[PDB]
Amino acid sequence: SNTQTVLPFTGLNTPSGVAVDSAGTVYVTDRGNNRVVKLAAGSNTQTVLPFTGLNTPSGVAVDSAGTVYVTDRGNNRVVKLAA
Amino acid sequence: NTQTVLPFTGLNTPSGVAVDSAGTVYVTDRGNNRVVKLAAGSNTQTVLPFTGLNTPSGVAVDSAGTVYVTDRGNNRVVKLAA
Amino acid sequence: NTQTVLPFTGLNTPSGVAVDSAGTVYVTDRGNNRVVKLAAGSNTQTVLPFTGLNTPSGVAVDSAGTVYVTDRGNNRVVKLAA
Numbered sequence A: 001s002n003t004q005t006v007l008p009f010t011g012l013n014t015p016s017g018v019a020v021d022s023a024g025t026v027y028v029t030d031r032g033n034n035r036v037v038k039l040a041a042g043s044n045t046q047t048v049l050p051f052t053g054l055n056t057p058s059g060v061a062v063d064s065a066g067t068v069y070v071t072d073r074g075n076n077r078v079v080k081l082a083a
Numbered sequence B, C: 001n002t003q004t005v006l007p008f009t010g011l012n013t014p015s016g017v018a019v020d021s022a023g024t025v026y027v028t029d030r031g032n033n034r035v036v037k038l039a040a041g042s043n044t045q046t047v048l049p050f051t052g053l054n055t056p057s058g059v060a061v062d063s064a065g066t067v068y069v070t071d072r073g074n075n076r077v078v079k080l081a082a
Helices: none
Strands: A004-006 A015-020 A026-030 A035-039 A057-062 A068-072 A077-081 B014-019 B025-029 B034-038 B045-047 B058-061 B067-071 B076-080 C014-019 C025-029 C034-038 C056-061 C067-071 C076-080
Touching (some): A015 B067, A026 A057, A026 A068, A068 C014, A068 C025, B014 C067, C025 C056
Parallel strands (some): A015 A057, A015 B058, B014 C056, C014 C056
Antiparallel strands (some): A015 A026, A068 A077, B014 B025, B034 B045, B067 B076, C067 C076
């Protein structure tokens, strides 16, 4: 027998991509809501990252400085946001 | 400039990939509602014991070998400890 | 904070993204059947020499710089060494 854990993100619609940084913060592209949300390790409350003008964001990555990169699928671009 | 096709089998619309420190490769096998992994060396493919996935879309693995999946069809994010 | 747009060119439905320890950004340019990368500080992307992709959906990179891609339309996973 095994255990899987549902992360306490809220109000997701068609989540499309996930990244995890060195601190254990989890970042998710909430595709159907045109937004990117995150949850700190231990934290109970998701925060919405201040990207703008997203259309169907499809993927997310985070580098060693905590910069977050997102593929903005509907706008044919990749956007990044410093920590 | 030679690419190598990995010995995964039975994939249907694979949607995401992650690789851990040991070189194990994890794939969200979206059309089969599962996540599979391929062990380095042995090339043994196993299905990760997630349950109730619907069109999983993205996967990540952290330094502790915890696997995170976006369970797209169920509007949730799930993880599985090593 | 204010977002920055990376100087990729000609993307069509980019589907996935990874960044390695060197800050190189790798993107699956799904609608163009290709994978592109941008070195930190560069303004000119390079197209990785994969072959025969059909709607690549996700990308990962390991510590040796090997790039892994889910080639969604061909139900396979391919890799290319650095």
